A = this chain, B = another copy of it.
Amino acid sequence: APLHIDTALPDAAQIQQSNSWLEISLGQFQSNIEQFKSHMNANTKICAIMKADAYGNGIRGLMPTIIAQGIPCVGVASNAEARAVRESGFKGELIRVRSASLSEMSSALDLNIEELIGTHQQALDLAELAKQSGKTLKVHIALNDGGMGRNGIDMTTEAGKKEAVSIATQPSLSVVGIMTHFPNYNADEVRAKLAQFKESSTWLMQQANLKREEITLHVANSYTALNVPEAQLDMVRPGGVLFGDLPTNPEYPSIVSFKTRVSSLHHLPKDSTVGYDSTFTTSRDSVLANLPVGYSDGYPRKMGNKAEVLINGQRAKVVGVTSMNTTVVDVTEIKGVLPGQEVVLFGQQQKQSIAVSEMENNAELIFPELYTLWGTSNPRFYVKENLY
């Protein structure tokens, strides 16, 4: 992950100078947050999950919306993300949503992150860090009832139950949450695992002398929060749905568009090869649009000969394999095309839209594999509507 998130938000002139860029819909982000809220019980808390620089969309540009919406909690992964959140002015709860090395945890003390622990050694290390900083560190205990086998403590054996109690009883540590996380989008499975979570959490709080009123129980990602409402418990952890990436719930549109421009228009006769490996050959006299985007910007090699882009409101086929920095598109039968026109790689342009399913099928990736790396490799520009 990046060691620091660019403090400045790119402006319009910087956009006219960029080869490729992301346009982030602040209005769509707001609408998605408000729609999500409509399905939450009133006193269920919301922890907005902002890991991977807000799912590629950019923590610094989105935090004013999180604050304006009165969201009490934010989740992050890296120390740089935690720093960006605090530099926004956010004074709410800040949690880490993954296991983090002692190196990482120790260097983050001034950011007041609530760490996520699932092993005795993590508990011992944080207890020592607490005694060294003269603080009481706040932690969430990850349990494995959801079956992620990732950050949590599995309690299906005697040894695991004993380790869980040892995690929960360390000195100079404040257990503020107990959580799990689910691996699949199956409501019957989540209901069965939620019941086990209630049993394991109850048992752990009893064995460790914890006070129910001081613990936040939380298990729900976006899917679970919306499709299994009894799992909302004390707090929910939506990420993807806020950004408009929840496949089960298409009523939250994506907030991101990926764009480039037409650099140049090239006339090619019939029987001309295009791209590395000569994987495409023109069958007719052609006009090709040369775009200054490639796989180094996050537009994969596999898009070639499969994907379409939007130019001047029309779909145009990507031909030849994508190069590191350049993509070639067949505009022979596209009217009105000129150098400098905007090209949509993902998103909408006029009435046409490149769907998430197209991206996934063409790239052979899941959508977040694309957009998280779009966000590290291109500037983000924020759009918001207002009344005139």
Over the window 162-199 of chain A, the binary record of Cβ atoms lying under 8 Å from chain B Cβ atoms (1 yes, 0 no) is: 01000000000000000000011000000000000000
Over the window 102-121 of chain A, the binary record of Cβ atoms lying under 8 Å from chain B Cβ atoms (1 yes, 0 no) is: 11101110000000011101
25 contacts between A and B (CB under 8 A): A1-B20, A98-B292, A98-B325, A99-B292, A101-B261, A101-B340, A102-B339, A119-B264, A121-B265, A125-B339, A144-B272, A148-B273, A149-B266, A150-B274, A150-B323, A151-B264, A152-B266, A153-B266, A154-B269, A160-B269, A295-B368, A295-B373, A298-B373, A324-B368, A373-B373
For residue A52, CB closer than 8 A to chain B, the reply is yes
The interface-forming segment of A28-36, A228-236, A347-355, A374-382 is: A374-382
Instruction: Please name the residue on chain B nearest to A4 by beta carbon.
Output: B6
Asked whether, in the complex, the Cβ of A264 is within 8 Å of the Cβ of B1, the reply is no
Over the window 139-155 of chain A, the binary record of Cβ atoms lying under 8 Å from chain B Cβ atoms (1 yes, 0 no) is: 00000100111111110
Given A264-B119, A301-B369, A328-B150, are A19 and B6 also a contact pair (CB < 8 Å)? no
Please give, as numbers and ranges, the residues of chain B lying within 8 Å of A298 by CB-CB distance: 373
The interface-forming segment of A9-17, A65-73, A86-94, A310-318 is: A9-17
- Least CB distance from A343 to B in Å reads 11
- Least CB distance from A167 to B in Å reads 11
Q: Identify A264's interface contact among B106, B121, B373, CB under 8 A.
A: B121
How many angstroms between the C-alpha atoms of A379 and B3 in the bound complex?
A: 6
For residue A300, CB closer than 8 A to chain B, the reply is yes
Given A16-B106, A148-B274, A183-B276, are A1 and B296 also a contact pair (CB < 8 Å)? yes
Please give, as numbers and ranges, the residues of chain B lying within 8 Å of A6 by CB-CB distance: 4
Nearest 10 A/B pairs, CB to CB: A149-B274, A52-B296, A296-B372, A376-B377, A17-B107, A16-B103, A99-B263, A3-B379, A77-B325, A147-B273
Instruction: Please name the residue on chain B nearest to A288 by beta carbon.
Output: B149
How many angstroms between the C-alpha atoms of A148 and B274 in the bound complex?
A: 5
Please give, as numbers and ranges, the residues of chain B lying within 8 Å of A156 by CB-CB distance: 269, 272
For residue A205, CB closer than 8 A to chain B, the reply is no
Q: Identify A272's interface contact among B154, B264, B366, CB under 8 A.
A: B154
Given A119-B266, A267-B159, A267-B160, are A290 and B16 also a contact pair (CB < 8 Å)? no
Asked whether, in the complex, the Cβ of B297 is within 8 Å of the Cβ of A1, the reply is yes
Asked whether, in the complex, the Cβ of B295 is within 8 Å of the Cβ of A372, the reply is yes
So how many copies of this chain end up in the complex? 2
How many angstroms between the C-alpha atoms of A377 and B366 in the bound complex?
A: 18
For residue A320, CB closer than 8 A to chain B, the reply is yes
Given A157-B269, A290-B150, A373-B376, are A184 and B16 also a contact pair (CB < 8 Å)? no
Asked whether, in the complex, the Cβ of A376 is within 8 Å of the Cβ of B379, the reply is no
Please give, as numbers and ranges, the residues of chain B lying within 8 Å of A247 by CB-CB distance: none
Over the window 236-274 of chain A, the binary record of Cβ atoms lying under 8 Å from chain B Cβ atoms (1 yes, 0 no) is: 000000000000000000000000011111111100111
For residue A45, CB closer than 8 A to chain B, the reply is no
Asked whether, in the complex, the Cβ of A104 is within 8 Å of the Cβ of B17, the reply is yes
Please give, as numbers and ranges, the residues of chain B lying within 8 Å of A10 by CB-CB distance: 3
Please give, as numbers and ranges, the residues of chain B lying within 8 Å of A147 by CB-CB distance: 272-273, 278
Instruction: Please name the residue on chain B nearest to A369 by beta carbon.
Output: B295
Instruction: Please name the residue on chain B nearest to A279 by beta carbon.
Output: B183
For residue A365, CB closer than 8 A to chain B, the reply is yes
Asked whether, in the complex, the Cβ of A301 is within 8 Å of the Cβ of B366, the reply is yes
How many angstroms between the C-alpha atoms of A247 and B3 in the bound complex?
A: 32
How many angstroms between the C-alpha atoms of A56 and B325 in the bound complex?
A: 13
Asked whether, in the complex, the Cβ of B263 is within 8 Å of the Cβ of A100, the reply is yes
Known contacts A99-B292, A151-B264, A373-B377; 15 additional CB pairs below 8 A are A4-B6, A77-B325, A101-B339, A103-B261, A118-B266, A119-B264, A125-B339, A147-B278, A148-B276, A150-B323, A154-B272, A183-B273, A184-B278, A364-B364, A376-B376
